[PDB]
Amino acid sequence: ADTVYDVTTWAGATVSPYVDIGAVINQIIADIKSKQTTQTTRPGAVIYIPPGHYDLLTRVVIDVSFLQIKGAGHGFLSEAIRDESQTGSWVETLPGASHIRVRNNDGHNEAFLVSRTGAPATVGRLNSIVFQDFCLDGVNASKPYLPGNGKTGISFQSDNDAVRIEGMGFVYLAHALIIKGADAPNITNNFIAECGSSIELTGASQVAKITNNFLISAWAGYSIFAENAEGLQISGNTILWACNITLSSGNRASITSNKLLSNFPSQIALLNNSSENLISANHFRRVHGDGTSTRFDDKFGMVHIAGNKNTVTGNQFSFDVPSQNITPAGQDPTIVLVKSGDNNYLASNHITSNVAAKVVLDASTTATRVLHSATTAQLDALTTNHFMVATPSH
Amino acid sequence: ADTVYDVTTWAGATVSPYVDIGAVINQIIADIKSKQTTQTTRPGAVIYIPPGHYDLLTRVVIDVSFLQIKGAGHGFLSEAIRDESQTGSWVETLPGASHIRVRNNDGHNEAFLVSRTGAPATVGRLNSIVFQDFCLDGVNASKPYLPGNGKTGISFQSDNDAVRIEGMGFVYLAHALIIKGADAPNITNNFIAECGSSIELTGASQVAKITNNFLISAWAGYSIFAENAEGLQISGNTILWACNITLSSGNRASITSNKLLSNFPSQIALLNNSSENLISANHFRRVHGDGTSTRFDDKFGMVHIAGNKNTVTGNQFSFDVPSQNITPAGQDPTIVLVKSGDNNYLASNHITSNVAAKVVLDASTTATRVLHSATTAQLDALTTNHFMVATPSHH
Amino acid sequence: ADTVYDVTTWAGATVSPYVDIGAVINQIIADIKSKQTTQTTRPGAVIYIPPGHYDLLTRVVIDVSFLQIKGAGHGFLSEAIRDESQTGSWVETLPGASHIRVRNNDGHNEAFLVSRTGAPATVGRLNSIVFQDFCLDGVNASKPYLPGNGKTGISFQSDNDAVRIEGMGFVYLAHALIIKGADAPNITNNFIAECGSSIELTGASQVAKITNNFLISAWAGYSIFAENAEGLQISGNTILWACNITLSSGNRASITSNKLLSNFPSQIALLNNSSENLISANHFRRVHGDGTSTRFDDKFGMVHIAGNKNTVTGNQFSFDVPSQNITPAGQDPTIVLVKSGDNNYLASNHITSNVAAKVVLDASTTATRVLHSATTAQLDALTTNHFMVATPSHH
C-alpha cells in the first residue's frame, strides 16, 4: 500500500533525512494530505525511521489523525554521564537506534508540534496519533536542563483523543512531552531521562494513562505535571532522581504501584484543591545529594496535600537525609503535609526515616484521619480537628 | 522468508482486501496451510495490514497456531460523539490506522473466529496467536450497543494457550473480544470503547492477564466478564463509562492498581461463590447521567460480593449521584454489598460520598471483618456475625 | 537504509539461518561493525527474524549498543504438556513464531551473550539493546529444568544501561534471562515458562523494572533473583507454578500489584539484610502438588524476611496444602516468617488457610508491627519485642 513510508527510501524528499529529518517528515505529511483528501478517506499512514543518526533542523507539524511514527527502539545513552567522563575510548558517545538529534534552526523550540487549527467541534480533534520506539535527543544540555537548552520533544497543542506515546526514548530536552487538552492519552513503556520535565498534561485532561515508564527528569521541573486533570491513572512507573508528580486542580486520580524516588521534596503534590485522589501501594524514597536545590524546603512534604478527601494507603515512606542538610535548619522534615482541606485519609503507611520526621496537619485542615500511618511521635497536628489511631509505639 | 504477508501486496489474493479483507486473510491462511503441512513444520506466519479502510464481508477462521495479524495502530475515533454531532467540517469521520470495517454478509456475526475442531487432547490447542495494533469497527451502532448490531470483533471458541491481544482498537461492536477456554491469555495495552462488552472470558479460564487497557464499554454488558476464572490478574487498567468487572465463580483473582469509573452500580461483582479474590489499591468513582439504566439499583453496590474470603484493601470509593437520581428513592446507596459468604475482609478503604452511603452486610454473611473501612454511620450490618473496627468519626 | 537486516534475506550470510541462526547473526554483527566504525557513527541496527524454525548452533555475542533483534511473537507452546501427552494427531508439536531452537554445539550454555570487554568507564557500557517478540526454546528438558539442559536464553555479562526485553517467549531453558550489572533494565510483557529460572539480576543492579510478565519457572530456581539490587520495581506480573522472588541484599524494592502463585514455600524471600522493601497489593496463593520438593519446608514462609524496615500491606495470603503434605509433620505452616531484623511492618493483610497457619516472629527480631494482619491465633511471636493490633476474632 502507499500508506507506508521509510524516511530513508522515500524518493519524494528534497533533502536528506540525515541532514534534516523534520523537512523530510513534513514533506511526507504533505504527500499524505495530497492523497487522503476527504472525511472518509483519511485512514493515516506509517512513517518508519530505521536506525541512524538524523538531524532535525525544521519543526514537524502534524495535523493528521492516525499517523504512526515508529523506529527501532528508545536508543538511550546517558549524555549526563558522558559529559562528566573521559570518553576518548568509549565505543559510542551518542544515543542511537532511530535517533533524532533535535537541532532546530527554524526559530522554533519543538521537534514535533501536533496541532490542528480551528475549533475541535467544527474541524474535529486529532485522534490516535502514535509515536513509538524512537529517540528524541537535545544533543547538549546542562543540569537541571530547565531552562536548559529550551528544547521540546513532542508538543500537542490542540485537543486530542486516544493519542499514544510508547517505547520511546527522550534525553537532554527541557520538556520531553507536553500534551495540551488530552482525552484518554496513553503514555506507556517510555524511557525519559536527563530532561528538565518528563510529562506535562497542560490546559486540561481526561483519563490520561501513564504506565510502565522510566521517568528521570531533574529538580527544576516535573516528572508528571497535570492541571485541570480528571481521572489520571499513574501506575507501574519507576520515577527517579527528582520524582515530582504535581496535580493542579486534579481530581479522582489513581496513583498506585509506582517506585518513586527523589533527592528533593514534593514527590507528589496535590495542589489548588486537588481532591479524591488515591495514592496507594507506592514505594517512596527521599535521599539527598544527586544535585541540590532550594526550590522546596523539607517542610513541604514528600507528599503535599491541598485539597479534600484524598486517600493515602499502603505506602512506604523511606527518608534518608543527613540532619545537617535538612531545611529549615533544626526543623524536623515532613513526610506528609496536609496543607489544607477536609476529610483527607491516611491509613496503613510505614514511615522509616533516619531522623525524626512528621506527618503535619495544618491548622486549617478538618477531619483528617491518620490510621496506622504515624506513631504519636510522627504526628504534628496543628488542629484538634483530626482523628488519630496511632501506629503503636513506645 | 515466505512467512510474511501484506494483505495489499500479496499476489495470491483473488479479491481486493479493501473490498473484503476477510476473504484475503482466509486465502492467506489457506496458502500457509498448503506450505506448512506437518506438526514440526508449522511455525506460523505474519499478516501485516497497512493503514487503510478495509471492509470485511467474510468471517475469518483461524485454526493455525502462532499467527500474527498486525497493523499500524489502534485507530480509535469516537463514533458515539460523531453520531451526536454536526460533522460536516470534521477532517475525519471514521476510525483509522489499519481499519477493518466489520460488515459481514455471510450470515456470521464475528470478524475473526479463532477455532479448531476436535478434542484438544487429540488435535492440540491453538497456541500464541497474536493480534496487534489494528482497529476493528462495527461501523454503525446505537447505545448501549447490546444487543446493538450483534457484531463481534474477535472470538476464540476452542481451547487456547498464551494468546495475545495487544495495542488494538475496538469500537462500535456488540462484543469486542470473546475468549472461551483460555489459558494464560494476555490482553494488554488495548483501546476498547463504545462497545456493548469489552472482554468476555467464557466457559472457563486460567491465569488471564488483563493489563494497561482502556475499557470503555456501556451499561448493558461487561467491561470484563469472566466465569469459572482461576487466577485472573486485572491491573493498570482505566475502565470507564460503565465499568463492570463481573466474576462468576471466579477465584484467586488479583484486581489491583486500576482506575475504575461507572455511571451505574456493579463496578465489581463477585458472583456465584467467587472466593479469595483481592481488590486492592483501586480508585472507584460512581457518578450519574452518562446514560441511564435500571439494570441495577443503587443498593446493588459499587462492589458486590457473593463468595468467601475476599479481600478489599487500600481503595478509594468516591460516590457522587444527585439524591433525586438515587434508586430506591430515599434509601442510602450501598458502597460495598457483602451479599453472602464467609470471612470476607475489608480494611483501610476510604469512602467519600455526596449523601450518606453504606457498607451493607447481608444477614447470611458470617465472620466479615470491616477494619478502618467504614465509620459507624457507614456500616449497615444485618447480622451480629461480623467484626467492626470503625473508622473514627467522633472526637 | 542499510541498518535493517532480515536473517533470511541478507545476502552476506555464508550459512543458512535455519541451520545456524547464531552464525548468521554473528555475521550480521560483523557487518555492522565494518560499517559503523567511530564513536559518533554507531547508531546500531535492526535484525528481523521472520516466522520460522531456526536452529542455533553457535553462541551469539553482542557488543553493539542499540541493536534490536525482533521477531513476530512469543511463539509459546507447552513442551511440558507435549512431553506427557500422546501427540500423534496434534496439529503442532513445536513452539513457533520466530522460533530459535537453542542447540549449541560450541560447549557454551548461552544462546545469546551480551558482553563488551574492558572497563565500562574506559570503553562504555552496552546501552539500550532491545530483544522483542521472538521465541528462545531449549528443545528438550525435564522438570524442574535445573540442572536440566544447562541452556541459557539471553545472558548480559558486562555492565549495561537501559536494556529492554519485551514480548518474548522463553521455554525449556535452564535460565531464561540473566542480566549482570544492570542499570535501569526493562523486562516487560514477556512469556517465560517451563524454565529452571526466569529472571536473574546478578552481580548488582539499579532500578530494574519487571512488569506485566508471565513468569512460570519451576521449583529448583527463581522467578526473579536479584542480588545487591537497589530500587527494583516488580509489578503487574503473573508469577506461577513455583513463584520465588528472592532478594539478596536488595533494598528499596517496590513489589506491588502482582498475582503470585507457588506449589512451594518462599514466594518472596528478603535475604541477607534486605531492607525497606514494599510488598503491597499482591495476591499470594500457596498450593501443593504441581511437582514436589523439599528445598524448603513449610516453616520457611510464603514470605520470608531477613532485614529491616520492610513493609507488607494490603495483600491476601491464601494457603491450601493438605495437612498430610505439610512439613515438618505436625507443625503449623508459616505465612510470613520474620526471621531477623528490626521495625518490619505488616498491616491490613488477609490470611486465609485450610489449616492453622501463622505469622512467626523469630526470637531475634525487634519492633515488628503486626496490625490487622493476623488474628491472635495467626500470630506465633517468639519474642515479646513486637506490637500486635490483632485482626478481631472474638465477640
Closest CB from C209, C253, C257 relative to A214: C209
Distance between CA atoms of C87 and B359, rounded to whole angstroms? 53
Question: Using an 8 Å Cβ cutoff, are C53 and C18 in contact?
Answer: yes
B234 Cβ contact list (under 8 Å, min separation 6): B210, B211, B224, B245, B253, B254, B255, B256, B258
Residue-wise burial string across B151-160, b where 16 or more C-beta atoms lie within 10 A, e elsewhere: bbbbbbbbbb
Q: In what order do the strands lie in the sheet with A238-239?
A: A52-56, A98-102, A135-137, A169-171, A191-193, A214-216, A238-239, A259-262, A283-286, A316-319, A350-353
Point out the residue among B50, B314, B372 whose CB comes nearest to the CB of A281: B314
B38 touches chain C (CB under 8 A): no
> Could you tell me the sign of the dihedral formed by the alpha carbons of C384, C387, C391, C392, in that order?
positive
Residues C233, B310: Cα–Cα separation, whole Å: 26
CA-based nearest distance B7→chain C, Å: 16
Q: What are the CA-CA distances from residue B70 to residues B134, B372, C307 (Å)?
A: 6, 48, 47
Residue of A nearest to C312 (CA): A314
Say yes or no: A148 contacts chain C, CB-CB below 8 A.
Answer: no
Q: Which residue of A has its CA nearest to C64?
A: A91
Q: Testing the interface with B: which of C259, C373, C376 to mutate, by most B Cβ within 10 A?
A: C259
- Rounded to whole angstroms, the Cα distance separating A291 from A196 reads 13
Question: Which of C137, C164, C165, C145 lies closest to C21 in space, CA to CA?
Answer: C137
Contact B164 C74 (CB under 8 A): yes
**Rounded CA separation C372/C351 (Å):** 10
Q: Which regions of A169-218 does DSSP assign to beta strands (E)?
A: 169-171, 175-183, 186-188, 191-193, 197-206, 209-211, 214-216
Return the C-alpha cell found at B204: 472457563
- CA–CA min distance C390, chain B (Å): 11
From the CA of B230, how many Å to the nearest CA of chain A?
23
Which of B163, B235, B370 should we substitute to test contact with C (largest number of C Cβ atoms within 10 Å)? B235
3-state secondary structure of A25: helix
C280 touches chain B (CB under 8 A): yes
The secondary structure element, H or E, covering residue A132 is strand A130-132
By C-alpha distance, which of A166, C280, A248, C53 is closest to B348? C280
Question: Is the distance from CB of A77 to CB of A126 less than 8 angstroms?
Answer: no
Q: B touches which chains (3+ CB pairs under 8 A)?
A: A, C
For C91, nearest residue in chain B (alpha carbons): B39
DSSP string, C158-184: S-EES-EEES-EEES-SEEEEEEEEES
Chain C residue numbers with beta carbons less than 8 Å from the beta carbon of B390 are: none
Residue C147 neighbours by CB distance under 10 Å:
10
Q: Phi/psi of residue B298, each to 5°? A: -80, 0
Q: Please state the separation of Cα B98 from the chain's center in Å.
A: 22
Q: In this structure, are residues B318 and B261 in contact, taking their beta carbons and an 8 Å threshold?
A: no
Query: Do A105 and A56 contact (CB within 8 A), yes or no?
Result: no
Q: b/e map of B181-199 (b: 16 or more CB within 10 Å)?
A: bbbbbbbbbbbbbbbbbbb
Of the candidates C96, C237, C280, the beta carbon closest to that of B42 is on C96
Provide the shortest C-alpha distance from residue B38 to chain A (in Å).
33
∠ CA B375-B376-B380, nearest 5°, is 110
A123: phi then psi, degrees, rounded to nearest 5 = -105, -5
**Are C198 and C218 a contacting pair, CB within 8 Å?**
no
Residue C329 burial class via C-beta count within 10 angstroms: exposed 0-12, middle 13-18, buried 19 and up: exposed
Chain A residues with CB inside 8 Å of C128's CB?
73-77, 95-97, 169, 191
The full length of chain A comes to 394
- Grid coordinates of C51: 516466522
Which residues of chain C does A234 touch, with a Cβ-Cβ cutoff of 8 Å? none
Of A65, A207, A276, the CB nearest to B96: A65
Buried b (16+ CB within 10 A) or exposed e, A104-114: beeeebbbbbb
Interchain CB distance below 8 Å, B236 and C257: yes
CA angle B142–B144–B145, rounded 5-degree value? 60
A257 near B CB under 8 A: yes
| SS3 assignment, position B66 | coil
Helix (H) or strand (E) holding B194: none
Interface of C with B in 194-223 (CB under 8 A): 212, 214, 216
Way the structure was solved: X-ray
- One-letter amino acid at C87 equals T
Half-sphere exposure (Cβ direction) of A207: Cα atoms closer than 13 Å: 23
Q: Which helix (H) or strand (E) holds B26?
A: helix B17-35
SS3 label, residue B111: strand
- Cell numbers at C110, concatenated: 548461552
* Contact list, C369 vs chain A (CB under 8 Å): 350, 391-392
CA dihedral B113, B119, B122, B125 (to 10 degrees): 30
CA distances B33 to A42, B27, B41, B45, C91, Å, are: 35, 10, 10, 10, 11
Of C286, C327, C151, C295, whose CA–CA distance to C222 is shortest?
Answer: C295
Enter the DSSP assignment of B131.
E
CB-based contact (8 Å) between C123 and chain A? Answer: yes
CA-CA distance, A330 to A316, in Å (whole number)? 25
**AA letter at C202:** T
Burial zone of C281 (CB within 10 Å; 0-12 exposed, 13-18 middle, 19+ buried): buried
The total of other beta-carbon atoms located within 10 Å of residue B114's CB is 24
Is the peptide bond preceding residue B144 cis, with omega within 30 degrees of 0?
Answer: yes
With b meaning 16 or more CB within 10 Å and e meaning fewer, what string describes A42-51? bbbbbbbbbb
Q: What's the N-to-C CA distance of chain C in angstroms?
A: 76
Which one of B43, B188, B311 has the shortest CB-CB distance to C189? Answer: B188
By CB atoms closer than 10 A (0-12, 13-18, 19+), residue B58 is: buried
Report DSSP state, residue A366: B
Distance (Å) from the alpha carbon of B202 to chain A's nearest alpha carbon: 28
C328 cis-preceded (ω within 30 degrees of 0): yes
Whether residue B328 is preceded by a cis peptide bond, meaning omega within 30 degrees of 0, is yes
Q: Does B51 touch chain A (CB under 8 A)?
A: yes
**CB–CB contact C350 B314 (8 Å):** no
Q: Is C292 exposed, middle or buried (0-12, 13-18, 19+ CB in 10 A)?
A: exposed
Nearest to A295 by CA among A170, A173, A213, A196: A196
CA B299 to CA B304: how far, in whole Å?
Answer: 9
Cell, residue B367: 465472620
- Closest by CA to B237, choosing from B265, B257, B252, B262, is B257
Dihedral over Cα of C382, C384, C386, C389: its sign: positive
Phi, psi of A203 (to 5 degrees): 80, -80
Contacting chains of C (3 CB pairs or more, <8 Å) are: A, B
Say yes or no for a CB contact (<8 Å) between B39 and C92. yes
Tell whether B149 lies on the interface with A, counting CB pairs under 8 A. no
Kindly write down the DSSP assignment for every residue of C91-143, as one continuous string: S--S--SEEEEE---SS-SEEEEE---S-HHHH--EE--EEES-EEE-S---T
Name chain B contacts of A123, Cβ cutoff 8 Å.
Answer: 89-91
Whether A212 sits inside 8 A of C207 (CB atoms) is no
d(CA C316, CA A84): 47
CA distances for B311 relative to A371, B370, C195, C284, C348, angstroms = 19, 10, 32, 12, 10
Sign of the alpha-carbon torsion through C80, C81, C84, C90 = negative
Chain C residues whose CB is inside 8 A of the B207 CB are 214, 238, 240, 259
Tell me whether residues A256 and C253 touch, CB distance under 8 A.
Answer: no
Distance of CA B372 to the CA centre of its chain: 31
> Is A348 an interface residue toward B (CB < 8 Å)?
yes
Residues in C touching B369 (Cβ below 8 Å): 350, 391-392
**For chain A, what is the total number of helices (H) and then of strands (E)?**
3, 40
Residues in chain B: 395
Q: Quote the CA–CA distance of C232 and C225 in Å, as a whole number.
A: 11
CB contact under 8 A, A314 and B348: yes
Domains of chain A: 1-192 (2.160.20.10), 243-394 (2.160.20.10)
DSSP A325: G
Q: Considering only CA atoms, which of C359, C362, C364 is closest in space to residue C388?
A: C359
Chain Cα centroid distance, residue C168: 13
Beta-ladder partners of A154: A112, A177
3-state secondary structure of A75: coil
Which member of C313, C318, C372 has the closest CB to residue B252? Answer: C318
Inter-residue contact C184 to C212 (CB < 8 Å) = no
Distance, in Å, from the CA atom of C192 to the CA atom of B147, rounded to the nearest integer, reads 39
Chains B & C: contacts with CB separation below 8 Å: 239
- H helix and E strand count, chain C: 3, 40
Cell numbers standing for residue C393: 476474632
Q: Which of A161, A94, C39, C183 is nearest to B171 (CA)?
A: A161
Q: What grid cell was written down for C83? A: 512431553
Chains that touch A (3 or more CB pairs under 8 A): B, C
Report angle CA B283, B285, B288 to the nearest 5 degrees: 170
Q: Does B354 touch chain A (CB under 8 A)?
A: no
For residue B143, the 8-state DSSP code is: T
CB proximity C297 to A under 8 Å: no
Q: Name the nearest CA neighbour of B56 among B101, B5, B119, B8.
A: B101
CA-nearest of A280, A351, A349 to A320 is A351
CA distance C246 to C263: 16
Q: How far apart are CA C351 and CA B351, in angstroms?
A: 24
Residues of chain A in contact with residue B21, where contact means CB-CB under 8 angstroms, are: none
